Design brief:
2 copies of one chain form a homodimer. By secondary structure, chain A is an alpha/beta fold. Chain A has 2 domains: 159 residues, Rossmann fold (3-Layer(aba) Sandwich), CATH 3.40.50; 191 residues, Dehydroquinate synthase-like - alpha domain (Dehydroquinate synthase-like, alpha domain, Up-down Bundle). In chain A, the strands form 2 sheets. The first copy, chain A, has a 6-stranded parallel beta sheet with strand order 1-8-5-4-2-3, with helices on both faces. In chain A, strands 6-7 form a two-stranded antiparallel sheet. In chain A, helix 2 links the parallel strand 2 and strand 3. The radius of gyration of chain A is 20 Å and the shape is globular. At the A-B interface, helix 2 and helix 3 of A face helix 2 of B. The complex binds nicotinamide-adenine-dinucleotide (NAD) and calcium ion (2 copies). One calcium ion (CA) binds next to loops of chain B.
Chain lengths: 351, 350
C-alpha cells in the first residue's frame, strides 16, 4: 500500500427527492431562525417560493447572484444579510449561487445550507473564487465549507439538457483528477470511481429524458461524490488549465471542462496508466479517447473553437499555463501543453 | 399599397472592422469631453484599456453592469457619473451593459456611445427593462435611444458559437414579426428582410468558422437591422409568448426564442402567408417549417423539454399567454396556444 492521509471534512448531507420541503427542519437543527435565501435571476421564482414556504424562518431573498462572484455584488448581499438580521444563508442554485453564499460566509461567518441544482459540486468544497478589479482570485479554508447540503433531485428536473451534460462532465473532471492526485487516498479514489460510474450511467439517460427522476437522482448522487473529492484532494493539469483559459479568455465554465477533459486526461494517462485504469474500464477504452467518445454521446461541445477561442490565443495560453509550477504525474511542459491546446482547439479525438 | 406612418429618431451608426479604435473621435464629434466607460465585472480589463485609449476624455470606469439592470446598481452608477462630472457613457459589451447606459441616460440625460459585442440589438432600440425590488419593469422613449453605435466585428470573434446561434435566432425573431406588425411600414419591412437575409447567410458560416471576420461582419450587420426593427414597430405573438413563458418559468431568453420561433411564425403564417412570403423565400418556401430546418442547421435547442420545461407547465403558460388581449394577424385562442406549446415541447416540426 502507498502511504496516505485521509481527512474527513465535516458534513451534513440530506439526500432525497422532495427534501427541500424540509429546509425548515435543517435551519432549526442548527439552532438558527433567520435565513437569507440566495439565487441568480434565472432561479428567482424558486428562491421566492422557498422563502414563502419558510414563513418566519425566511429573513429575506437576494436573487442577484452573478457569474464569477464579483466582490461588489457580495458587498451588496452582505448588506442585505445584515439588514435582514439573517443568521444563515440558504443557497438555491448552481456553483455561482453556492459561491455567493460562500463569499457571504467569509465576511459574516453565516452558516450555509446549500441546495445544489447543478453538478458543479461546490457545495462540498472549501474553495471560493471571486472577481475583484476585473481579475479572478481563488482561496480556500474551513470557514468556506458549507455546513449543510440538501440534495433534492426534483429541483434538477428543470436543469436544461445542454448544461446538464457539460456540468455533468465538470463533475466527472473532479473525479478523474482525484485518481492521480499527489495526496490521493483510498477513500477519495473509491468515491471518485463510484462518482464516475454514476455520471456515465445517468447522463445519457438524462439527455433523452430530462424529467426521469431516477436518472436525475443518480446524476446528483454522482455529483456529490465528485464534489467531495474536489474538496478532499489536490487537482492538477485539468483544473489549472480550465482556470487559466476560463480566466484569461472569459470562456463558459462547464463547457471549458467538457472540451478539455478528454485531452487533459489523455496527457496524464501517458504517465498514470494504472491510476486511470478504473476510468478507462468505465469508458470501455482509453481514458482520454473514451471520454471524448462519451462526451460525443452526450452531444457536448468538443472544440475550443466552438467556445470562441482563436488560433492566435493558443500560444499565449500555453505560456500562461506553464508560468506557475504545480505538481502533475506528467510534468507540465510548454510544447506538450501547446500540442494539447491544438488538439482541443481542433476538437480532435485524443490519440 | 397599405397606408403607413414612418418615424425615425436620430442615431449615428459607425460600422467597420477596427472601428472601436476610433471611439475618441466619436466622443469629440458630439462636443463631449467626460465619458464614463461602462462594463460588466468580467470585462473591467477591456473597459480600463478603452478608458486609457480615450486619454483626457475618460472621466471614469464603472464596471458593475448586472443582468436585468437592477435599479440598485443604476443608482450607484448614477452617483459615479455625477461625481465624475460626466457628460456621456460609453457602453462597452453585451446587452446588460447597453441596459445600464440607458438607465443612466434616463436619469442624467447622458449621451450614449454604445460598442456592442453581442447580437442583443438593445443599442438601437428605445426600450429599457429594469428590475426594482425584484419586479421587472419596461418602458420606452426617445430619450433612451443611444446617440451613437460603433459596430466593430473584431470584438465579436470570441462570442461562443452556442450563444451566437441562439441570440442570432432571437434577433431574426424581431425581423420576422416586424413583417406583420400592425404598424408595419416599408422601411421596417425592407430592413427586416435584409436582416433575415444577413443572418441566414452568416450564422451557418460563423458556426463553422467563428473567427471569420466576413461572416462576423455580416452577422453583426444582421443584428443591427433586426434590433432596429424591434425598436421601430410593434411585436406580436412570438415576443409575447417568449416574454410570458421565459419569464414565468425563468428560462434563458435566447434559447426560448430559438425554440418557439418556428412555431409562432408557423401559427401566424397559417393566416397571413403573404406578409411572411419574403421570409419563406429565404428558408425554402414555408417560413415556419423553414425556420425549424434553419435552427437545426445551427445546432440550436429545438424543444421546450430540452430547456427543462415540464409537461405540467404548459397549461398555466397558455392561460398566462392569453391573460392580456393584444394584436396579432391571427386571433390568439388559448386552445391553439396550448397546442403550439405542446408541439414546441415535443420539438415537432411545424
Ligand atoms: N469553488 C468550487 O469548488 C467550485 C466547483 C465547481 C464550480 N465552481 C464555480 O461555479 C461556477 C459555475 O457553476 P455552475 O456550472 O453550476 O453554473 P451556474 O451556477 O453559473 O449556473 C448557470 C445558470 O444555470 C442556472 N441553473 C442552475 N441550476 C438550474 C436548475 N436546476 N434549473 C434551471 N436553471 C438552473 C443558473 O441560475 C445560472 O443562470 C463557476 O464560477 C465555477 O468556478 C466552483
Ligand atoms: Ca462556517
Ligand atoms: Ca439621449
Amino acid at each position: 500500500m502507498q502511504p496516505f492521509v485521509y481527512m474527513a471534512a465535516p458534513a451534513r448531507i440530506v439526500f432525497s427527492a422532495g427534501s427541500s420541503a424540509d429546509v425548515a427542519e435543517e435551519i432549526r437543527r442548527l439552532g438558527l431562525s433567520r435565513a437569507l435565501v440566495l439565487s441568480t435571476p434565472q432561479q428567482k421564482g424558486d428562491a421566492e417560493a422557498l422563502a414563502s414556504r419558510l414563513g418566519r424562518l425566511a429573513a429575506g431573498v437576494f436573487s442577484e447572484a452573478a457569474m464569477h462572484t464579483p466582490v461588489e455584488v457580495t458587498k451588496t448581499a452582505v448588506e442585505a444579510y445584515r439588514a435582514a438580521g439573517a443568521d444563515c444563508v440558504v443557497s438555491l442554485g448552481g456553483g455561482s449561487t453556492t459561491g455567493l453564499g460562500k463569499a457571504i460566509a467569509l465576511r459574516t461567518d453565516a452558516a450555509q445550507i446549500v441546495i445544489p441544482t447543478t453538478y458543479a459540486g461546490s457545495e462540498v468544497t472549501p474553495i471560493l473564487g471571486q472577481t475583484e478589479n476585473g481579475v479572478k482570485t481563488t482561496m480556500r479554508g474551513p470557514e468556506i465549507l458549507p455546513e449543510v447540503v440538501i440534495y433534492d433531485a426534483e429541483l434538477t428536473l428543470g436543469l436544461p439538457v445542454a448544461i446538464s451534460m457539460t456540468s455533468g462532465l465538470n463533475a466527472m473532471a473532479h473525479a478523474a483528477e482525484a485518481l492521480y492526485a499527489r495526496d490521493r487516498n483510498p477513500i477519495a479514489s473509491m468515491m471518485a470511481v463510484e462518482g464516475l460510474r454514476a455520471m456515465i450511467e445517468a447522463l445519457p439517460v438524462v439527455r433523452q429524458a430530462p424529467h426521469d427522476i431516477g436518472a436525475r437522482e443518480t446524476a446528483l448522487y454522482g455529483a456529490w461524490l465528485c464534489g467531495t473529492v474536489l474538496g478532499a484532494v489536490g487537482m492538477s493539469l485539468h483544473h489549472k488549465l480550465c482556470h487559466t483559459l476560463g480566466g484569461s479568455l472569459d470562456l463558459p465554465h462547464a463547457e471549458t471542462h467538457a472540451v478539455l477533459l478528454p485531452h487533459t486526461i489523455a496527457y496524464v494517462e501517458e504517465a498514470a496508466p494504472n491510476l486511470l485504469a478504473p476510468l478507462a474500464a468505465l469508458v470501455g477504452g482509453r481514458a482520454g479517447a473514451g471520454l471524448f467518445d462519451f462526451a460525443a454521446r452526450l452531444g457536448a461541445p468538443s472544440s475550443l473553437a466552438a467556445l470562441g477561442v482563436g488560433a492566435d490565443d493558443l500560444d499565449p495560453m500555453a505560456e500562461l499555463a506553464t508560468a506557475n509550477p504545480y505538481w502533475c504525474p506528467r510534468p507540465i511542459e510548454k510544447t506538450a501543453i501547446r500540442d494539447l491546446l491544438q488538439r482541443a482547439f481542433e476538437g480532435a479525438r485524443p490519440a
